[PDB]
Design a protein around this ligand. Structure first.
Ligand code: NI
Length: 341
């Protein structure tokens, strides 16, 4: 049964609610982004209208085989009417195709559902600037002040400088990057660009990337592993055993691996600067954990909310424990008292 924080009152709508069977009263199912915790339940046998971005609709059709007649892609930054209700999709600064949804209820209430997002000051100049929001359904993944991490631009600068140094010192080093979902593509694309290489990967990952409308993608990626010195592997294989095994397969072309695991936050963030990050090393293999986040830090989240000034906040993450819920409610009240709304 569908939980309340996935229902939009005063509508026939749900958000990211595909794992509950047929939801009573639902006339349109919205999908914010193509991550498995949110799409859980969708398949070629789904027969209700799914509303989403163009990129999400490419992935639904090609990866999950949802039939075309049920996919309803909407342009961004554009007022659209769905089952008699005005909606707008906004870029969420999460993974490719990820959106926030603005719903203009028939009674005058305005609701923003962030989906998953990484808040940014640029959002203060979208279509959000133009009217008041009563209710905010908020991605609270890192809603606590201990969650700090650098900008994506600092993290990419570290990755590129690290990879370029290693491979210039040793032209026989291979670079490997972990992945297990869409998102974080800048990591492996920026490294391959500094090295003058395409990114090599499995046919299944190449297929996924070909759905993302990335400019000039045919120039950046390939399934010919032998032509590439940046390889993508499943996240589960980014360990000393799995990387040793991969190095065997390359037919003595390489004699060293430099590997990256983009994580979200880890507790080595509470002590160490990005500049000071070091790898774990075993023989000719080194593994870097880099804190590349596609979710808001605490301070980015707090800035967004204090700017938006919502009347009510509904968290969508960390909702399963009383201790989490009570922590989050305390920060919401602080923010409201400090800013005066
Ligand atoms: Ni996500």
């Amino acid at each position: 049964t569908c939980p309340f924080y996935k229902k939009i009152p005063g509508t026939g709508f749900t958000v990211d609610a595909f794992q509950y069977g047929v939801v009573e009263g639902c006339t349109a199912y919205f999908l914010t982004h193509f991550h498995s915790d949110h799409y859980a339940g969708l398949s070629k046998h789904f027969t209700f209208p799914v509303y989403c971005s163009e990129i999400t609709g490419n992935l639904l059709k090609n990866k999950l085989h949802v039939q075309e007649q049920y996919i309803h892609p909407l342009p961004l930054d554009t007022e659209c009417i769905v089952n008699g209700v005005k909606v707008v999709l906004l870029d969420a600064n999460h993974c490719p195709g990820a959106v926030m949804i603005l719903f203009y209820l028939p009674n005058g209430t305005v609701i923003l559902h962030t989906g998953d997002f990484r808040a940014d000051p640029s959002m203060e100049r979208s279509l959000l600037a133009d009217q008041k929001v009563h209710m905010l359904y908020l991605d609270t993944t890192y809603c606590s002040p201990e969650y700090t991490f650098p900008s994506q631009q600092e993290v990419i600068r570290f990755a590129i400088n690290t990879a370029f140094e290693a491979v210039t010192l040793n032209p026989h080093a291979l670079v490997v990057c972990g992945t297990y979902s869409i998102g974080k593509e800048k990591v492996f694309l920026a490294i391959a660009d500094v090295l003058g290489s395409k990114v090599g990967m499995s046919q299944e990952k190449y297929k996924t990337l070909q759905c993302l409308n990335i400019p000039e993608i045919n120039s950046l990626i390939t399934t010919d592993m032998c032509s590439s010195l940046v390889h993508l592997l499943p996240m589960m294989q980014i360990n000393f055993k799995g990387l040793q095994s991969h190095l065997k397969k390359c037919g003595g072309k390489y004699n060293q691996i430099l590997a990256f695991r983009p994580t979200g936050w880890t507790h080595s963030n509470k002590f160490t600067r990005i500049a000071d990050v070091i790898p774990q090393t075993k023989g000719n293999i080194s593994i870097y954990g880099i804190p590349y986040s596609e979710h808001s830090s605490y301070l980015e989240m707090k800035r967004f909310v204090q700017w938006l000034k919502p009347q009510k906040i509904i968290p969508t993450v960390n909702v399963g424990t009383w201790k989490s819920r009570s922590t989050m409610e305390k920060y919401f009240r602080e923010w409201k008292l400090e800013a005066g709304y």
